[model samples]
Target: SGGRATQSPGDSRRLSIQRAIQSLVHAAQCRNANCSLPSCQKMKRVVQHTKGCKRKTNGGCPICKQLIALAAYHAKHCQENKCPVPFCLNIKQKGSGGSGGSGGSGGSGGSSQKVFVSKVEAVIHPQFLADLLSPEKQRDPLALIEELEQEEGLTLAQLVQKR
Candidate 1:
């Protein structure tokens, strides 16, 4: 059979929300480093909580804890896209009030649903910016190149030649 598995609308919505959450988690993790700043500590704690840690406190920051909790809640209840969390990427579709017809006959009204596209804004904390520009932890381009080469199992010379 030349058929592929298809996801239902609910499944698609859930997957979208899950991916958004994962992206946010990844951003937080990437910014995390050996910093004593409050924001960095909070981000680290949130990452830890997401990783199933039984920590009592989320770095003592209520706002970060609330955001992490809201993300977790939305991951489970993805139908409610009107989340108060600013980092939430899930968007509710507009003009979807009318119910679809169950039978082959179309509905009486010819009104079409409106498509609403939402964009996810990248959330970058001030502490992360400080860490990136700090003298002690400045990123080395050469180190990144070496890391990439190791992960891809290819040398920089080989990659340059292929390009």
Candidate 2:
């Protein structure tokens, strides 16, 4: 036959199982070579030289290699104190003033907050839709949205209901 091979969903699940087995084998190799397990001679040396077992989690190990990686990342992305310039290192910290709203006062009774927040709803114009989808096959968003709602098992009233 000239047709391509067709894999059932079960075949896809089997492929995932195979990949998981391979992952476990590779993890065992990595743990034996790099972790502080009995099989790792380099880890033993690192412990003796550093006076502690090798740390596994991110930001836990102070090894030279880990330090170099952190330094490189900090140099590019940390902006907070102890963080290298150009990139603020605060992974989850709040930003300083300057987000939204008018910079100058409107000369009326109003307070200025350090952080400003606003919301926006995306309205895809025809030009943007044309660029995203081929002009020949692009369909109406309202029709697509209605079809998606029905296929996803949501009624028009349920879809429009507030969260």
Candidate 3:
């Protein structure tokens, strides 16, 4: 008990933008091919624009420029080295002399990305009074992430690391 703490408590306002980028990540991997939802269409356009564009840049086009921003953010937030989000690893592995490659982890029985690892509390409706006093939402983050990985058939790179 002879040191400062790293988990400092504080107020912040970056979640709005951060969560927005997450939505983009989610939308890009959605199952639907004909989605018209505003956010869903974003991924569609992102893909559309991304293909022709350099997929990374600066003093440049809107679609191309934003692509790198999203990828960069994804690279930082990703927990697993294997991310489903496209370009996540490209940027992570190849930043401007920022760091060396992750590892020489090529030796294997080949490739597959079914890594697993959580829990949650969520809801909606006009039963605020009823729900307030009743705190049943707290839950098992263990099977939460484990089960969803099987149910959704998608990789969850956000939280696979062990504590």
Candidate 2 lDDT over 1-163, as tens digits, reads: 3334334332232223222222222322353433532213322232232233344223233232222222222223333364421112231242333221121212232111111121110111112122213233334332333343343343223446674
**Considering lDDT, where higher is better, how would the candidates rank from best to worst?**
3, 1, 2
Clash pairs, candidate 2, are 77-87, 78-87, 78-88, 78-89, 79-87, 79-88, 79-89
Worst 10 residues of 2 by lDDT: 113-122
Alpha-carbon RMSD, each predicted model: 18.0, 25.5, 18.7
The lDDT per prediction is 0.34, 0.27, 0.37
Indicate whether candidate 1 or candidate 2 has the larger TM-score. Answer: 1
lDDT of 1 by residue, 60-154 (tens): 33223333433543334344455443323332332222212112222232211112121111121212222323345334222332343343343
Q: Once model 3 is optimally superposed onto the true structure by TM-score, how far is the C-alpha of residue 127 displaced, in angstroms?
A: 34
Better candidate by TM-score, 1 or 3: 3
Q: Model 2 segments beyond 4 Å from truth? A: 1-6, 32-163
Most accurate candidate by lDDT? 3
Sort by TM-score, best first. Answer: 3, 1, 2
Worst 10 residues of 1 by lDDT: 113-122
